[PDB]
Amino acid sequence: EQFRIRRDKRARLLAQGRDPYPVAVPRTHTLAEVRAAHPDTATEDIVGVAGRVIFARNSGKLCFATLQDGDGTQLQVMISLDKVGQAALDAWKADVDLGDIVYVHGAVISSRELSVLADCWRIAAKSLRPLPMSEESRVRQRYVDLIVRPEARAVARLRIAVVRAIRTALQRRGFLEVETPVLQTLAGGAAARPFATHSNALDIDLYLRIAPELFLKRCIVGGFDKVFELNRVFRNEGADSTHSPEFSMLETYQTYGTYDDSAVVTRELIQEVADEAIGTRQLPLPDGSVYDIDGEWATIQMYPSLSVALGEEITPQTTVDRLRGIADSLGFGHGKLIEELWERTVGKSLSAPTFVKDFPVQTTPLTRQHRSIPGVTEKWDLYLRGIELATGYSELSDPVVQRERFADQARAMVLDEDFLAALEYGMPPCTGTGMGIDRLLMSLTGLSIRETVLFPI
Amino acid sequence: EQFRIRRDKRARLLAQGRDPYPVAVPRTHTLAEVRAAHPDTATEDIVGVAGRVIFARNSGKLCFATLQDGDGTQLQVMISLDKVGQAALDAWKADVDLGDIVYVHGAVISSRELSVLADCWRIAAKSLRPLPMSEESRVRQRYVDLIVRPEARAVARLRIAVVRAIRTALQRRGFLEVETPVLQTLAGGAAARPFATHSNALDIDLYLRIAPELFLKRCIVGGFDKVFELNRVFRNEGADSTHSPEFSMLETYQTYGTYDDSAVVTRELIQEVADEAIGTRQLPLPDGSVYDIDGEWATIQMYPSLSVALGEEITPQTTVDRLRGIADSLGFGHGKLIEELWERTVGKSLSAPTFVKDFPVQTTPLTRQHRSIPGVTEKWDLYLRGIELATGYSELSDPVVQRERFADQARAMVLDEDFLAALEYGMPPCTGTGMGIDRLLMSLTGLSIRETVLFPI
Numbered sequence: 001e002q003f004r005i006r007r008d009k010r011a012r013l014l015a016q017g018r019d020p021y022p023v024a025v026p027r028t029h030t031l032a033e034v035r036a037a038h039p040d041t042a043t044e045d046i047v048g049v050a051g052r053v054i055f056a057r058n059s060g061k062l063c064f065a066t067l068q069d070g071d072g073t074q075l076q077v078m079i080s081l082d083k084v085g086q087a088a089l090d091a092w093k094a095d096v097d098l099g100d101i102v103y104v105h106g107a108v109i110s111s112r113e114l115s116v117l118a119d120c121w122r123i124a125a126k127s128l129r130p131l132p133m134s135e136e137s138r139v140r141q142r143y144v145d146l147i148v149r150p151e152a153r154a155v156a157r158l159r160i161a162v163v164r165a166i167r168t169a170l171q172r173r174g175f176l177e178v179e180t181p182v183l184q185t186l187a188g189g190a191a192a193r194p195f196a197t198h199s200n201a202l203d204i205d206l207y208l209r210i211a212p213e214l215f216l217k218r219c220i221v222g223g224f225d226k227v228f229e230l231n232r233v234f235r236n237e238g239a240d241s242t243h244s245p246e247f248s249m250l251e252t253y254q255t256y257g258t259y260d261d262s263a264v265v266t267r268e269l270i271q272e273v274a275d276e277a278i279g280t281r282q283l284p285l286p287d288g289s290v291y292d293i294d295g296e297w298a299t300i301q302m303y304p305s306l307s308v309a310l311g312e313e314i315t316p317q318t319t320v321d322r323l324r325g326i327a328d329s330l331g332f333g334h335g336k337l338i339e340e341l342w343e344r345t346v347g348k349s350l351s352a353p354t355f356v357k358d359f360p361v362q363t364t365p366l367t368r369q370h371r372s373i374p375g376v377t378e379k380w381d382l383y384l385r386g387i388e389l390a391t392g393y394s395e396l397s398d399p400v401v402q403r404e405r406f407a408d409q410a411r412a413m414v415l416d417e418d419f420l421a422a423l424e425y426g427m428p429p430c431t432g433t434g435m436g437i438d439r440l441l442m443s444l445t446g447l448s449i450r451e452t453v454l455f456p457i
Numbered sequence: 458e459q460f461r462i463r464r465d466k467r468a469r470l471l472a473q474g475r476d477p478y479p480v481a482v483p484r485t486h487t488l489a490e491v492r493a494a495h496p497d498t499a500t501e502d503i504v505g506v507a508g509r510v511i512f513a514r515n516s517g518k519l520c521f522a523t524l525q526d527g528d529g530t531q532l533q534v535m536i537s538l539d540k541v542g543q544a545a546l547d548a549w550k551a552d553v554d555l556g557d558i559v560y561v562h563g564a565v566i567s568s569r570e571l572s573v574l575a576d577c578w579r580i581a582a583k584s585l586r587p588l589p590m591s592e593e594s595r596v597r598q599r600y601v602d603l604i605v606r607p608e609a610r611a612v613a614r615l616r617i618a619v620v621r622a623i624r625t626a627l628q629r630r631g632f633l634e635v636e637t638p639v640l641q642t643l644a645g646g647a648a649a650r651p652f653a654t655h656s657n658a659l660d661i662d663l664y665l666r667i668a669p670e671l672f673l674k675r676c677i678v679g680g681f682d683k684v685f686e687l688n689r690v691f692r693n694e695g696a697d698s699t700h701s702p703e704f705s706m707l708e709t710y711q712t713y714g715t716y717d718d719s720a721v722v723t724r725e726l727i728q729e730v731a732d733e734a735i736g737t738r739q740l741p742l743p744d745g746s747v748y749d750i751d752g753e754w755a756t757i758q759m760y761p762s763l764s765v766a767l768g769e770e771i772t773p774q775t776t777v778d779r780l781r782g783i784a785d786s787l788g789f790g791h792g793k794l795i796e797e798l799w800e801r802t803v804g805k806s807l808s809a810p811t812f813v814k815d816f817p818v819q820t821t822p823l824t825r826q827h828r829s830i831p832g833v834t835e836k837w838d839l840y841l842r843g844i845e846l847a848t849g850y851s852e853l854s855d856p857v858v859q860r861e862r863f864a865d866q867a868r869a870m871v872l873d874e875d876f877l878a879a880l881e882y883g884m885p886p887c888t889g890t891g892m893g894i895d896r897l898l899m900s901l902t903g904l905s906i907r908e909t910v911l912f913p914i
């Protein structure tokens with residue numbers, strides 16, 4: 001209803017020569033800065049402050065109101081009669097609503113609560129909607145969420161702190177951030193249905209990237225020692241609590257190191273992120289518990305660990321007829337089956353931060369064959385607080401193998417021949433990694449994927 | 458031809474038990490690091506180095522070869538007979554081609570040129586393609602370009618240095634980088650044909666963002682004091698030397714400042730970028746000239762400056778029948794005409810860094826009406842070295858005006874009602890800006906748009 005009462009006070013401010021949306025009011029300080037510089041008498045420090053009025057208490061010849069700056073800091077104001085204007089007091093009473101941004105120049109004082117008492121005051125913006133929420137309305141209107149709910153404020157700022165931490169971490173180690181195409185003639189470097197968009201300029205279809213690996217790899221051919229890219233990827237698939245079709249994603253590549261190297265870094269990275277952004281490696285969680293991610297983290301092998309949990313020897317050689325069987329007696333091909341069985345037994349048991357290494361050849365086209373063990377590739381996954389957080393490879397640089405690997409993939413015939421060309425100019429040995437920002441945050445906080453981004457749907 | 462000779466030496470290395478693409482060779486130092494620590498005698502510093510062999514000179518019982526690290530630094534190697542192996546020398550002669558990555562452990566020495574003389578040596582990767590180029594092949598194969606052409610190396614690293622400079626600059630001033638949706642239900646915050654992609658998850662079409670403004674604005678409602686976002690946008694339109702359909706783009710928003718504020722920053726920003734990434738504000742250019750971007754930069758008004766150059770008074774009031782006329786006598790509506798005429802007269806004259814401010818209402822739906830002058834909006838553009846580099850607004854926060862502005866835009870009817878909702882919760886006065894990374898680099902270097910990105914097409 002009050003929609004209309006608000007719109008009325010707007011135009012009755014316009015016509016009256018009052019500006020309800022001024023170009024520029026002279027704020028001298030953020031409320032934070034007033035607080036930070038003032039730990040029942042009066043002081044002669046004068047400031048201009050601005051602030052949302054998120055609490056009124058109009059009372060005759062004095063109105064007391066609370067101002068909340070964007071970040072949520074608060075300073076009370078006391079709009080008075082004798083300090084300037086009787087039209088002042090009336091206009092204040094008349095024209096101020098709740099969720100109204102308000103500039104207030106004057107002196108800052110101790111009260112019976114730190115307030116500021118006005119010489120000047122002026123409306124900086126007029127709300128045409130009061131402040132009130134289901135969680136699928138918080139996401140629809142993050143801009144109100146951010147006003148009403150502190151935790152929204154804190155989470156948004158966390159994601160940001162975390163992303164900066166990552167950049168600090170990588171940069172300190174000599175990593176260089178790069179930009180690779182989002183629109184590509186064919187999308188690759190991962191396994192998912194791409195998004196297709198039609199180009200006017202070319203009259204061909206183009207695909208949004210599912211991942212930067214293939215282009216990041218061209219860079220390593222190029223002479224990049226150490227590279228990464230933090231940026232959205234697009235997977236044209238369903239959404240669940242760990243999956244969304246557009247999400248932010250880290251990738252990383254270092255020359256002259258293997259998956260054993262890239263797992264040391266990933267741990268240090270993650271822990272360094274905890275330190276900067278959170279201040280503890282003893283992570284408090286919604287239920288009140290604490291997940292420790294400090295010290296050293298356990299590595300297991302996929303086949304061995306799967307073997308122990310099944311009570312029988314599973315290997316690269318174990319046939320699919322055998323695996324299908326074991327699979328049934330709990331409830332396509334080999335690689336899928338190994339990972340499936342592993343995840344469904346060992347995977348779901350895990351608590352503490354855990355790496356799992358030495359993976360089925362079938363389901364790892366891009367990662368080098370293992371240096372000693374036949375049948376497996378030098379890939380790891382990291383399961384942190386029971387979430388598939390991150391992946392690392394010793395990267396396959398043999399073009400003929402890589403060609404072979406791809407052709408078989410297609411057989412259930414257009415291959416990325418430029419990718420393959422690049423490799424046959426010579427890619428030095430490198431370990432890549434991959435990590436998801438939403439899950440990084442989930443794994444650290446227990447927040448849902450839908451709370452870790454500013455604007456989902 | 459040598460394609461096949463190469464592929465042969467690969468499999469004849471495999472079968473022979475030699476690994477042509479090893480998982481991990483123990484590099485102890487980058488060539489840079491060897492150089493940096495060694496300004497015709499011998500020294501007992503031992504290292505393992507890796508490097509592309511970009512020059513052979515095989516000669517009996519000594520081969521001299523040059524190794525080029527990814528960044529382009531060079532150390533010569535001297536594969537010998539007596540220092541280890543006679544099969545060594547032969548295998549070296551036999552199996553080494555050009556564009557081959559090669560690990561060489563041994564002692565570092567002064568020669569008659571700083572080389573390294575080997576105990577061990579081993580092929581790190583085998584090329585199946587020699588090193589050779591038109592400019593529309595350099596772009597098709599940036600990974601070779603980066604190997605062969607220094608300037609490619611330098612440019613790639615420049616773009617990177619520049620992007621870091623921006624982040625430093627903004628962060629120092631207290632800006633917070635944010636991530637807003639690339640996929641949106643309707644795309645806005647600029648004027649261009651969007652890219653449409655179909656979603657499986659929802660069975661609706663979605664549009665890649667043409668710009669982040671509208672979502673960045675929701676953030677300011679949200680309580681963000683100071684925000685920005687450096688990231689690709691997508692405009693489904695033609696390519697020219699200043700326009701590409703996917704490009705990287707900065708946007709910026711500060712509360713409690715106007716377009717006069719955001720132009721001070723933009724200048725300081727740009728100049729600070731020059732200092733960090735280039736080391737001079739006296740910019741050397743291809744023709745050998747120098748563009749000075751130091752000191753203070755000139756502001757002009759659009760109508761006034763257009764008036765002087767036409768020799769007659771043009772204003773908001775000047776009719777379209779008049780403008781069409783002037784337009785003819787050189788060779789839709791008012792706003793378009795003003796900007797058109799301005800660009801075609803004053804625009805093309807400009808040399809020195811120049812701001813142009815106070816713009817036609819029609820062609821600036823999102824920027825506030827000017828605080829005193831009727832008919833114009835408080836928007837500026839920055840023309841640097843004759844290129845439309847950047848834009849700044851005092852941002853329109855009046856929702857009813859903003860609603861009005863939009864409806865008229867549609868009339869040549871679906872409006873972004875959530876955008877409009879956000880504004881009617883109250884957006885404090887803020888100045889936004891917008892800047893293009895490719896043009897930033899063009900404007901600084903004289904490089905084409907197609908050289909400023911890693912991977913175009």
Ligand SMILES: COc1nc(N)nc2c1C(=O)N([C@H]1CC[C@@H](O)CC1)C2
Nearest residue numbers: 242243244247389390391434435436
């Ligand atoms: C929301 O996160 C994701 N959404 C989709 N739709 N797909 C993936 C993620 C995610 O975090 N992924 C990573 C998992 C660890 C590594 O394999 C890197 C990718 C895949």
Ligand SMILES: COc1nc(N)nc2c1C(=O)N([C@H]1CC[C@@H](O)CC1)C2
Nearest residue numbers: 699700701704846847848891892893
């Ligand atoms: C390659 O750069 C661009 N490509 C397209 N297709 N459109 C634009 C640019 C660019 O740099 N733009 C900016 C110009 C200054 C400001 O108005 C911000 C946008 C628009």
Ligand SMILES: N[C@@H](CCCC[NH3+])C(=O)O
Nearest residue numbers: 189190211213432433434
């Ligand atoms: N492309 C991988 C991430 C990088 C892995 C290392 N090569 C993925 O989408 O999971």
Ligand SMILES: N[C@@H](CCCC[NH3+])C(=O)O
Nearest residue numbers: 646647668670889890891
């Ligand atoms: N959306 C603008 C850039 C930001 C201008 C300030 N609001 C553009 O695409 O040019």
